[PDB]
Design a protein around this ligand. Sequence first.
Ligand code: 1OR
Ligand code: 1OR
Length: 264
Amino acid sequence: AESRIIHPKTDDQRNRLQEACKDILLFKNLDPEQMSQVLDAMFEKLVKEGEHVIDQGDDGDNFYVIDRGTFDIYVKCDGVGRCVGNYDNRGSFGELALMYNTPRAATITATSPGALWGLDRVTFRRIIVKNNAKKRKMYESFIESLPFLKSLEVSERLKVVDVIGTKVYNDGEQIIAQGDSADSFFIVESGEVRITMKRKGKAVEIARCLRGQYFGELALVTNKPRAASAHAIGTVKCLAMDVQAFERLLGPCMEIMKRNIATY
Ligand SMILES: CCCN(CCC)c1ncnc2c1ncn2[C@@H]1O[C@@H]2COP(=O)(O)O[C@H]2[C@H]1O
Ligand SMILES: CCCN(CCC)c1ncnc2c1ncn2[C@@H]1O[C@@H]2COP(=O)(O)O[C@H]2[C@H]1O
């Protein structure tokens, strides 16, 4: 079809568009064809400190990917809204409205001047939601066999795959580095992950994660930095998700985790 949306861009815009998108979990499973359709529909939108890019309750129009600038996340608790987190010069938001045809479930506002790459909902539903149909096949059984995910309404566990993204790693490849700031949760799908620990300089092995085992969740809960490095042992495939997604769907897991986290 030629009813596709296309926003002509300069070589520079595409370059930046490219950097901004390299790590967006929602694009991880798209073939080159699907990705280029997406990129063509991306439009640039500048923002200013204080600007309410999204207001809770509003209608879902676009999906956003951050090019730069800081942001704050706000939710209303009984009528009072609080900063429940934030984004820092990278990440994506505004997908829930388009995926589930529901009102914006939060408020996003620039906490400094920024820029964004938006994606209309027609394109988003046409390609990303289609993409989720594929991901569900591939990982529905698997995800539904992960013990730590028993504590979730049958319905909640369904929306999990909708926001995970597949990351491939070669042998010897670093997945996360101890110390670094954390913005993602991992779940080994295939291969093996070696977890090691070091000391203040420039390495003791402390665990091995196999298909079905998660890691990188400690720093998300303790709101602390990476407490250990992770490396791929041979080809590894992890099903990942950002913290916002983590806290949004995994709250019902923090217990069985916080407890089993004592085993650290
Ligand atoms: C820190 C996680 C906070 N939680 C969970 C609390 C209920 C969130 N709960 C719901 N939506 C969130 C959350 N965080 C970011 N968004 C993003 O803010 C967006 C607002 O538009 P949306 O509902 O279409 O999609 C949303 C998400 O990408
Ligand atoms: C049973 C070994 C327990 N220990 C060693 C005790 C000091 C651990 N101590 C600290 N982190 C561990 C440990 N095991 C796995 N991780 C995982 O390795 C991850 C490193 O990133 P993270 O800190 O965000 O979350 C971590 C855990 O999922």
